[PDB]
Amino acid sequence: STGSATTTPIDSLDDAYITPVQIGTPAQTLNLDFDTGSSDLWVFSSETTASEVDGQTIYTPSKSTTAKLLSGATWSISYGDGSSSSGDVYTDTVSVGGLTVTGQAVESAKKVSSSFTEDSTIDGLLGLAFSTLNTVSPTQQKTFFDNAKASLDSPVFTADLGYHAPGTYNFGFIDTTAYTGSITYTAVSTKQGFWEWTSTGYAVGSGTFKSTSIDGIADTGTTLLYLPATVVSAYWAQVSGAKSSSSVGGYVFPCSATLPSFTFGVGSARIVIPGDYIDFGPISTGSSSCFGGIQSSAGIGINIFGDVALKAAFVVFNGATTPTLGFASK
């Protein structure tokens, strides 16, 4: 089997991407944030505290003929941005892009933090990191990908995120029309439950490539590119007037600037992030200070190749017995 679904930016900045997901019988379609940095499939639901729902579409298990309470199971998750959610668990039929899993754990939110309530465009998350991170207790649950794997034509999924445009998540096949050149594969460590890999270095603009190992994670659920302070300083030093602002919470730059590209290494291959991908616009409405898309990972404890980086590539998440990541230009 295979599946193929379109993923759409939630706003003009590509702050996140939503993908429609069918849950239950008859189908209830929710728009979920596919997150390769977590391992829970959770939804706004009929159980969510009413004051914490503001425009989201909810899953109502009592309207699904295939929903079953997973008795005694609870979940609770905290993300890198300080957001959180928790609740109970149902099993139900879940389909993505024509690919169906029966018996998928669908984590029903009873509580969500303010950042979720305030984002009316995201109806929940679909985790695509390794199932070792799943938070369901007392019986840990599998991700949609792990449950689909054995049925797929190839044990892979691919992320093809758009810049200010829709893109695609494919499951079970590699669309050889969706990228240019060849795919470079690189080793993954699953020790922390992430798609963790080591970049071979970077360049700023037209500058020389610096060969240096940068361990980090491929995380579709993180907007920006978070790298070591040395790398980030080297980037922003090439933008007149850029500075790190403790008041704003990272590097800002004059909105009049033209940003340089950023290149990262994948083995001997190179992925170029155009400068315009690194512009996240005014820090507040009407400001002439703009927020940067490359930020320091210091104090986060891991480097994160988030959407800024991943949307410059066609990315293969190879879930074979020995997992690997692949990157191609596009």
From Swiss-Prot:
Q: List the disulfide bonds.
A: C255-C290
Stretches of the chain forming a coiled coil according to its record = none
Keywords assigned: Aspartyl protease, Disulfide bond, Hydrolase, Protease, Signal, Zymogen
| Hydrolase keyword on record | yes
List its EC numbers. 3.4.23.22
- Domain called Peptidase A1: residue spans: 17-328
Extract one GO BP annotation from the record: proteolysis
| Active site residues per record | D35, S199
Catalytic activity annotated for this protein?
Hydrolysis of proteins with specificity similar to that of pepsin A, prefers hydrophobic residues at P1 and P1', but does not cleave 14-Ala-|-Leu-15 in the B chain of insulin or Z-Glu-Tyr. Clots milk
According to its UniProt record, which protein family does this protein belong to? Belongs to the peptidase A1 family.
Q: What is this protein called?
A: Endothiapepsin
Taxonomy of the source species: Eukaryota, Fungi, Dikarya, Ascomycota, Pezizomycotina
